[PDB]
Write an enzyme that holds these catalytic residues in place. Structure first.
Site, PDB file in Angstrom:
ATOM      1  N   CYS B  86       0.880  -1.193   0.000  1.00  0.00           N
ATOM      2  CA  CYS B  86       0.000   0.000   0.000  1.00  0.00           C
ATOM      3  C   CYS B  86       0.905   1.227   0.000  1.00  0.00           C
ATOM      4  CB  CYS B  86      -0.995   0.025   1.155  1.00  0.00           C
ATOM      5  SG  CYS B  86      -2.599   0.707   0.653  1.00  0.00           S
ATOM      6  N   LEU B  87       1.144   1.757  -1.198  1.00  0.00           N
ATOM      7  CA  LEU B  87       1.955   2.975  -1.384  1.00  0.00           C
ATOM      8  C   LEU B  87       1.321   3.850  -2.462  1.00  0.00           C
ATOM      9  CD1 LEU B  87       4.334   4.764  -0.878  1.00  0.00           C
ATOM     10  CD2 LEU B  87       5.823   3.141  -2.024  1.00  0.00           C
TER      11      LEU B  87
END
Ligand SMILES: [Zn+2]
Ligand SMILES: [Zn+2]
Lengths: 182, 153, 607, 126, 132
Positions: B86-87
């Site tokens: 999750c970036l």
DNA sequence: GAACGGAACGCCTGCTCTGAACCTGTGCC
DNA sequence: GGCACAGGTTCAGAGCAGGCGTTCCGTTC
């Protein structure tokens, strides 16, 4: 070629028409020298009737002409075109033209022909209106050709006053079970 | 083409001046994609861990971000059981924050930043994002045991 | 939305009624303009639609009506917006003004099927603000010269006045231009010869007063040698050189000497310089007869026009030597030998019967007009030299006895045939200027020294009505088209001064002398000089209100705000209509009354 | 050669404006007796630096999209109208950036958008 | 060309329409020197009339290489005649293959120019006399 | 409460308005 | 009786406005 090009400075006024006839004589007799003849006839002093004649005498042998020369040919046809000689030449033009036939130099001058036709039809609504009125009058035949499509797309791309009329004509044509995949 | 001109400065820049706790070299298995090692963030449960990442460079890179996964298993809120990250700077605008003002190093720095600081508002793992928040020591225990079986040697 | 805007406006002015009631609510005219203004803070999503709109407007409601109020005015006001919209997107948006001016000439050029005077006046104000743009956009200007033989006279004549600021700076483009004008000179299309003249006449005009001066004084003499071909070419193309060379002279003084010999050669092909040869001029060599097509080419009356103007110009402005002191004696000799040229000289009246199907009749009819207009150029000259010398005014009388005999002769010839002979109503070539100064001398001179010479032209009633009639012809030309015939043609200010001078005398004779004093009968009652004074007065006040919209103040100053001046002038027609009507009922002058009204009308649109 | 050449300016549009404007004032003060340099220094009223090459040996004058000089003949020419970025780019790179994003808004053959590095208005004319 | 040239020309009522393509045949870049030579072995084996000459001038217009064996025969054949075509043909030979003109071939050309129907004789004899 | 007859907005066309030219009545020498 | 202005008339053709077709909702037994 140079003598041809210089004939307008040379000849006196009594002997224009004379030269005219015998240049049309040279025209059927050699193709290679179509361009400068044409340029000459248009920089002479003549009678317009004769110019109609020679323009048909272009049009009949226009399959025989190498592509390089066509643009200035068809430029000549579309400056010799009247408001009244519109559909006549255009129907004839629209028939005789092929653009299947021509095909690496071929493709480039085809493109350059289209540039030149763009500039013609871009540049007189006379043609655009009548051009269309000549493609709608070919809703009869299922057999109207690549040129008619590409030409429509072109007048929509360039000419603005007509956009509704192209769309109207294309929609009344396409519903009719005309233009399809093939 | 552009892939070559970025990757040229980047491969060279990650051999000569990589960020602290971080390395990236042209993979010896894969001589097209990049292997990174991010060494477990200080005062995080990842302490004593060496975390391998594969960085996939897209074809229209640098118009697209790098494509990174944790190849070493990682017990983390923003990283799932298959290493998915999750970036924001792994996606394009508006969902993400990749643009050409960035590079493989700036994101691999932002990766060691996320190892130290999991975000509980982008949970891939709700069990770990909850545990991280509500029983920090159980998360830190499990992630440190994780670091001892998978990120150790 | 926009047009509604204008329908709302027009309606609300016309009546008193609606103005009362409605408080004047923002018109979408003024609203959009403020939009353009506030794109400066650089909202550049906006601008594409603004360009788009301004053009659409110029497209839809162009003057094709002109190739009332309701179909004309709210459809002027759509493009006059279009114009201001695109003028401001060009003067504000620096990025755009490449596609703007591209798309303007896109429409100016290959068209000329539907007119484009509005586009030309857009183009003009675009390039005048910042021509510097035009140097990135030369590509289109190079392919505009392409078709500069198939475009008509007025597209090209103006398109190029705009461009030429380029060709002082750029040069490759100037070697494209004279190349194109030259290749047009040797054309089929008749327009192309005249395109050549016009590009050449303007290259000679504003391409130097006298880069290096030596590469212009030579380049003007290069092209002017290629114009001695055009001085050979057909009638119309010559005519344009007689007329354009006067402005070439004004803007380029030093080519005077060369240009004089260019002309004076062309004179001598038809001037026979021997005393005691009674036709002094060769009229029958101006006439080409081939296959019963009998054309005038080299119009000599029009050549004398150019001659006579370049003449007075040289007397006055260049001097502060042998050709002009010869030409004094040339005109004095054409004078004295033409005086005594008795129709026997040019085979007229009895040896010719101007029979308009026959070759011979076409020749004789062409020459009577030539003679008439030449008589006029020399009436001017006899008047010009002398400050009212009784000999030269007797010369003038006899020159007019020539003109009038040829005139009443072609009137007798056109009194039999149908009134399609608009060739007699072909312009009298007297400069409006002389007309002015003349009629002032005729009707407004009381100085004892001049008065014996003027009593000649005043006993001559036809010369009076001749002068007037020319006043009427000229003003009419201005009404039809945006310029007059003679000299000082397209220079509005001069025209305006003359009209002021005109008014002064037209009213002066209209007032001092009424219509009721006439002693001449019904044929001279149908054209009494009073009446023609009043009609002249008519066309002016009308035409003023077309163009001279700012200066209407100045027009009155000639003669306390707009309303007292106009009121005092209204009183004069008002008292005239009262005195016209009250006196007689028997056979009242319907037309006199009719245009007393058309006047009291025109004055009224002011108040 | 000594005669006036066709010359024009690349870079930041706030820097090019006075230079073009002063060239237009002083182009008549060109004289073909002097050299090209001895006429340009008095026309544009400037000096030229002697090979800022050796001091600025890595200033990263690379596209900062693709990080290369010489992409297919093209040079880093398109720049930021900003004192704090000044980051050059290529025609191809900046176009494939500003067309890809949502925010980017095109008039005709121009794209207005945000500079990648500093997010300030930058204009690209194809 | 070994097939078709002969019959096009060994056809009667061969007009402008027919010649213009054998004109284009010889004028193509593609018609390599070697092949213009092989064209020569063929153009030369035919009965010579006006239709052979016009095409052949345009083959010889390149400076097609000649064994003097064939050049002489061209000249012999040329030298066997009233025609405008033939005038220009002879003229063009004697400017490009001046180089190939022997004393004996220049005698043949003196023979061949004998005619006073020959237009441009001054030119032809000036070129001839210029070889002497 | 439910069955019938009227209100609502996108499409097509006939009506109207205009303007341009030709022609046929009629006004005057 | 003959010719030309005048106004009637006639037609191309642009543009406008309202009634229909498919769909929802008030009204009356
Ligand atoms: Zn780049
Ligand atoms: Zn920036």
């Amino acid at each position: 070629h140079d003598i041809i090009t210089s004939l307008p400075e040379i000849l006196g006024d009594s002997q224009h028409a004379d030269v005219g006839k015998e240049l049309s004589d040279l025209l059927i007799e050699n193709t290679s020298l179509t361009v400068p003849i044409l340029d000459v006839l248009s920089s002479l002093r003549l009678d317009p009737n004769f110019l109609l004649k020679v323009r048909q005498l272009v049009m009949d042998k226009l399959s025989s002409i190498r592509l390089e020369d066509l643009p200035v040919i068809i430029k000549f046809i579309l400056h010799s075109v009247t408001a009244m000689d519109t559909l006549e030449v255009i129907s004839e033009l629209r028939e005789k033209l092929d653009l299947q036939h021509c095909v690496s130099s071929g493709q480039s001058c085809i493109i350059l022909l289209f540039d030149v036709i763009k500039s013609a039809i871009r540049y007189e609504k006379t043609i655009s209106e009548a051009w269309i009125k000549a493609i709608e009058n070919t809703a009869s035949v299922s057999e109207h050709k690549v040129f008619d499509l590409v030409m429509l797309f072109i007048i929509y791309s360039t000419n603005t006053q007509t956009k509704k009329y192209i769309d109207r004509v294309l929609r009344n044509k396409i519903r009719s079970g005309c233009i399809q995949e093939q | 083409m552009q892939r070559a001109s970025r990757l040229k400065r980047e491969l060279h820049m990650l051999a000569t001046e990589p960020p602290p706790g971080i390395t990236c070299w042209q993979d010896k298995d894969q001589m097209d994609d990049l292997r990174a090692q991010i060494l477990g963030g200080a005062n995080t449960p990842y302490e004593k861990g060496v975390f391998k990442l594969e960085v996939i460079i897209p074809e229209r890179y640098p118009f697209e971000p790098p494509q990174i996964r944790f190849l070493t298993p990682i017990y983390h809120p923003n990283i799932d059981s298959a290493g998915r990250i999750c970036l924001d700077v792994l996606k394009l605008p508006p969902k993400g924050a990749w643009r050409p003002s960035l590079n493989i190093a700036t994101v691999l720095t932002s990766i060691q930043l996320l190892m130290s600081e999991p975000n509980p508002d982008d949970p891939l793992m709700a069990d770990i994002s909850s545990e991280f928040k509500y029983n920090k020591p159980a998360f830190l225990k499990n992630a440190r045991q994780w670091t001892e079986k998978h990120a150790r040697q | 939305s926009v047009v509604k805007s204008f329908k709302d406006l027009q309606l609300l002015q016309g009546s008193k009624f609606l103005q009362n009631l409605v408080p004047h609510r923002s018109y979408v005219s003024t609203m959009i303009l403020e939009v353009v203004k506030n794109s400066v803070h650089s909202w550049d999503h906006v601008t594409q639609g603004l360009v788009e709109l301004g053009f659409i407007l110029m497209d839809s409601y162009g003057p094709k009506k002109v190739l009332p109020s309701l179909s004309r005015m709210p459809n002027q006001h759509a493009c006059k917006l279009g114009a201001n919209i695109l003028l401001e997107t060009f003067k504000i948006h620096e990025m755009i003004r490449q596609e703007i001016l591209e798309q303007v000439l896109n429409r100016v050029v290959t068209r000329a099927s539907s007119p484009i005077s509005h586009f030309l006046d857009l183009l003009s104000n675009i390039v005048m603000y910042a021509p510097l743009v035009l140097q990135s956009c030369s590509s289109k200007v190079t392919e505009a010269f392409d078709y500069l033989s198939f475009l008509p006279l007025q597209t090209v004549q103006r398109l190029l006045k705009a461009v030429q600021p380029l060709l002082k700076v750029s040069m490759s483009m100037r070697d494209c231009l004279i190349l194109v004008l030259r290749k047009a000179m040797f054309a089929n299309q008749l327009d192309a010869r005249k395109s050549a003249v016009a590009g050449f006449l303007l290259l000679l005009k504003n391409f130097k007063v006298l880069y290096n001066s030596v590469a212009n004084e030579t380049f003007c003499l290069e092209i002017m040698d290629s114009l001695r071909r055009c001085l050979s070419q057909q009638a119309d193309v010559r005519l344009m050189l007689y007329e354009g060379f006067y402005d070439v002279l004004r803007r380029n003084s030093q080519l005077a000497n060369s240009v004089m010999q260019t002309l004076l050669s062309q004179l001598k092909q038809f001037y026979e310089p021997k005393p005691d040869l009674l036709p002094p001029l060769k009229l029958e060599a101006c006439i080409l007869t081939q296959g019963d097509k009998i054309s005038l080419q080299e119009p000599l009356d029009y050549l004398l026009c150019c001659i006579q103007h370049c003449l007075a110009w040289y007397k006055n402005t260049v001097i502060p030597e042998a050709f002009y002191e010869d030409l004094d004696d040339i005109l004095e000799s054409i004078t004295n030998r033409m005086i005594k040229s008795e129709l026997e000289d040019f085979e007229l009246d009895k040896s010719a019967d101007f029979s308009q199907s026959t070759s011979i009749g076409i020749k004789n009819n062409i020459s009577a007009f030539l003679v008439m207009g030449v008589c006029e150029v020399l009436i001017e000259y006899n008047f010009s030299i002398s400050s009212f010398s009784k000999n030269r005014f007797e010369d003038i009388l006899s020159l007019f006895m020539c003109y009038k005999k040829l005139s009443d002769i072609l009137n007798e010839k056109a009194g039999k045939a149908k009134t399609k002979m608009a060739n007699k109503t072909s312009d009298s070539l007297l400069s409006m200027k002389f007309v002015s100064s003349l009629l002032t001398a005729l009707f407004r001179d009381s100085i004892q020294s001049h008065q014996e010479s003027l009593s000649v032209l005043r006993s001559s009633n036809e010369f009076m009505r001749y002068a007037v009639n020319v006043a009427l012809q000229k003003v009419q030309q201005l009404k039809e088209t945006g310029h007059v015939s003679g000299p000082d043609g397209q220079n509005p200010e001069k025209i305006f001064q003359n009209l002021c001078d005109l008014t002064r005398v037209l009213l002066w004779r209209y007032t001092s002398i009424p219509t009721s004093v006439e002693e001449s009968g019904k044929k001279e009652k149908g054209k009494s000089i009073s009446l023609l004074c009043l009609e002249g007065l008519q066309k002016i006040f009308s035409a003023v209100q077309q163009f001279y919209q700012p200066k209407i103040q100045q027009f009155l100053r000639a003669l306390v705000s707009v309303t007292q001046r106009t009121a005092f002038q209204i009183r004069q027609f008002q008292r005239s209509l009262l005195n016209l009507l009250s006196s007689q009922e028997e056979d009242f002058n319907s037309k006199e009354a009719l245009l007393l009204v058309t006047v009291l009308t025109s004055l009224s649109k002011l108040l | 050669p000594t005669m006036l050449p066709e010359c024009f300016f690349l870079g930041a549009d706030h820097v090019v404006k006075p230079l073009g404007i002063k060239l237009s004032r002083n182009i008549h003060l060109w004289d073909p007796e002097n050299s090209v340099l001895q006429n340009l220094k008095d026309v544009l009223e400037i000096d030229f630096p002697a090979r800022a090459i050796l001091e600025k040996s890595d200033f990263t004058m690379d596209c900062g999209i693709c990080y290369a000089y010489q992409l297919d003949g093209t040079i880093p020419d398109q720049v930021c109208d900003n004192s704090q970025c000044g980051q050059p780019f290529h025609q191809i790179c900046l176009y494939e950036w500003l067309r890809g994003l949502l925010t980017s808004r095109q008039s005709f053959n121009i794209i207005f958008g945000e500079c990648p590095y500093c997010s300030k208005p930058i204009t690209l004319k194809m | 060309c070994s097939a078709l040239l002969d019959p096009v020309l060994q056809a009667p009522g061969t007009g402008p329409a027919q010649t213009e393509l054998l004109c284009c045949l010889v004028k193509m870049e593609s018609l390599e020197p070697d092949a213009q030579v092989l064209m020569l072995g063929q153009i030369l084996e035919l009965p010579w009339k006006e239709e052979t000459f016009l095409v052949l001038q345009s083959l010889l217009e390149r400076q097609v290489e000649m064994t003097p064996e064939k050049f002489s025969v061209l000249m012999e054949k040329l030298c066997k005649t009233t025609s405008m075509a033939y005038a220009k043909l002879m003229l063009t030979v004697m400017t490009k293959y001046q180089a190939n003109i022997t004393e004996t071939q220049r005698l043949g050309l003196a023979m061949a120019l004998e005619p006073n129907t020959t237009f441009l004789r001054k030119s032809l004899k000036a070129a001839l006399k210029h070889l002497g």
